[PDB]
Design a protein around this ligand. Structure first.
Ligand code: HEM
Ligand SMILES: C[C@@H](c1ncncc1F)[C@](O)(Cn1cncn1)c1ccc(F)cc1F
Length: 527
């Protein structure tokens, strides 16, 4: 029976003869049907985690994961346990929930997983080339080592009065406050916190020159570049549209400003220990002798500042929002300010910040309820066996880990959805290496990453901005608490999170009503 093969060919010929309606109709029915037939077959493998079923091909569970990622995970965890895959915008994501997932992903061997393959398409078009994820891991490890050189205790000692002054200036001059002229007012915390975060971070990490730029129309380039930081970069990283060209123009104009300051400092040999720019100028030689270019130094600055912008601004937005319905906590924090700072007669110092455990537990608890990053990912480079299982995660998959999900589990945090800074009494550290330690190129960090509380990640990709974030959030909240009481308009409460930015932001407009503790207090200086 070669007669059959002839009819194969005849059928192929008649196929290409169909009316164009039926040919496009067939162009959609065939992949859909195949997609379901493939999942059903896939769901038989014993060496693959369960795969979340989905109707639309390529799209996958993208809509559900994107809008309600922790709800998606809880549903999947109830059905399939702690390991399961789901299709997402063309990728397969293998999720591993809970502390053993933290260990599987955050401590995966450098050979098995790649962060830069996962992230580069999100960050490289915003930050620029050659740094962070547009470079091999060992370069990244050392860039973190260079940034850490400016994030020392002694640096934080000089940043505290800089950050504090910036907050007072903001209270004095910003339209949102004007404390010298109003005793009460209403703000949207998603306007005020992003602005306060960029002003305080610029002044301390970037220096006075870069801070001064933000009082000009130059500040619009930060807005344009900020807009370019979006999950759309995973599908359309470059499209010949205005959004993208404004992004690229901002990246070039902003990195040009940094290089101009860098080259002017070197031209005058004016390199002190003022800011992170001084620091990187003195210290950006890799261990194989290669030196970072002024452009790579500038792109590193953008990426570090931009990442710290979003996480910190989100977090201080959430602190304000939780305290607006917790007058008890504001009272509690105010008393600690009065006791640590001798009734407000002692100036805030970095040392005194460490003696304010309730303030630091408020940051800590906010990073529990509202982790700014619901998902961290790697691309799997070599097949991985899931220990004590029959599961194998093949190369070309992605592993996804979500400590923010574990932060919200009653099993690890009793009453996980109640905001209680006292769940941290006797434990106000920003995190804790609770045992051994290892160095990946930027300093010794906890060897284990099994803690259920992992707001700053762990392993080779762990955050290097933790202590800067606490310093900055600490000075800002110390001043907010000693200066203002605040509350919600009638009937309003803590807004639910918006996860689509991939930074967990309050849903707007998130407004609070502030009023001066001392209506007669005046903020000195010029305006
Ligand atoms: C509330 C504040 C912050 C939180 C909760 C936070 C959280 C995190 C987390 C969870 C990671 C691990 C990423 C991964 O494993 O994929 C990370 C990495 C990182 N963060 Fe932060 N971060 C914060 C603030 C900052 C700040 C202020 C800076 C800079 C001053 C910064 C710079 C970095 C850097 C350089 C990395 C390393 C990424 C890598 O190795 O690939 N972060 N952060
Ligand atoms: C890649 C990015 C991210 N954003 C959102 N969901 C997951 C993510 F991994 C992020 O980790 C965010 N971030 C972490 N600490 C501060 N910012 C990041 C890290 C380093 C950096 F230099 C810039 C930067 F954006």
């Amino acid at each position: 029976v070669g007669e059959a093969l002839e009819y194969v060919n005849i059928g192929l010929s008649h196929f290409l003869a169909l009316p164009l309606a039926q040919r496009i109709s067939l162009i959609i029915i065939i992949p859909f049907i195949y997609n379901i037939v493939w999942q059903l077959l896939y769901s038989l493998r014993k060496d693959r985690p369960p795969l979340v079923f989905y109707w639309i091909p390529w799209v996958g569970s993208a809509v559900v994961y994107g809008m309600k990622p922790y709800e998606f995970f809880e549903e999947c965890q109830k059905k399939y346990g702690d390991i399961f895959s789901f299709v997402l915008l063309g990728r397969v994501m293998t999720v591993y929930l809970g502390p053993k997932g933290h260990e599987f992903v955050f401590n995966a061997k450098l050979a098995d997983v790649s962060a830069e393959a996962a992230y580069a398409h999100l960050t490289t078009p915003v930050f620029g080339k050659g740094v962070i994820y547009d470079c091999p891991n060992s370069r990244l490890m050392e860039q973190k080592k260079f940034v850490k050189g400016a994030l020392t205790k002694e640096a934080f000692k000089s940043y505290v009065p800089l950050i504090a002054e910036e907050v007072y200036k903001y209270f004095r001059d910003s339209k949102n406050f004007r404390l010298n002229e109003r005793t009460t007012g209403t703000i949207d915390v998603m306007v005020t916190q992003p602005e306060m975060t960029i002003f305080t971070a610029s002044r301390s990490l970037l220096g006075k020159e870069m801070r001064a730029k933000l009082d000009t129309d130059f500040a619009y380039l930060y807005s344009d570049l900020d807009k370019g930081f979006t999950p759309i970069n995973f599908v359309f990283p470059n499209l010949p549209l205005e959004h993208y060209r404004k992004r690229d123009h901002a990246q070039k104009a902003i990195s040009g400003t940094y290089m101009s300051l860098i080259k002017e400092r070197r031209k005058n040999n004016d390199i002190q220990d003022r800011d992170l720019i001084d620091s990187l100028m003195k210290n950006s030689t890799y261990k194989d002798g290669v030196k970072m270019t002024d452009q790579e130094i500038a792109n590193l600055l953008i990426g570090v500042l931009m990442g710290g912008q979003h996480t910190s601004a989100a977090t201080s937005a959430w602190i304000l929002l939780h305290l607006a319905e917790r007058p008890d906590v504001q009272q509690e924090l105010y008393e600690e300010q009065m006791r640590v700072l001798d009734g407000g007669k002692k100036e805030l110092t970095y040392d005194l910040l460490q003696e304010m455990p309730l303030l630091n537990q408020t940051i800590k608890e906010t990073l529990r309820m509202h982790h700014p990053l619901h998902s961290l990912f790697r691309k799997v480079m070599k097949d991985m066996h899931v220990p004590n299982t029959s599961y194998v995660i093949p190369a070309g998959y992605h592993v996804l880990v979500s400590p923010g999900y574990t932060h919200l589990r009653d099993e690890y945090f009793p009453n996980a959805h109640q905001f209680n800074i006292h769940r941290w009494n006797n434990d106000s550290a920003s995190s804790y290496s609770v045992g051994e330690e290892v160095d990946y190129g930027f300093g010794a960090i906890s060897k284990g990453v099994s803690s259920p509380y992992l707001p700053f990640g762990g392993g080779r990709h762990r955050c290097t901005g933790e202590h800067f974030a606490y310093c900055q959030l600490g000075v800002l909240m110390s001043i907010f608490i000693r200066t203002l009481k605040w509350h919600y308009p009638e009937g309003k409460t803590v807004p639910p999170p918006d996860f689509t930015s991939m930074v967990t932001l309050p849903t707007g407009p998130a407004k609070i009503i502030w009023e001066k503790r001392n209506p007669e207090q005046k903020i000195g200086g010029r305006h």
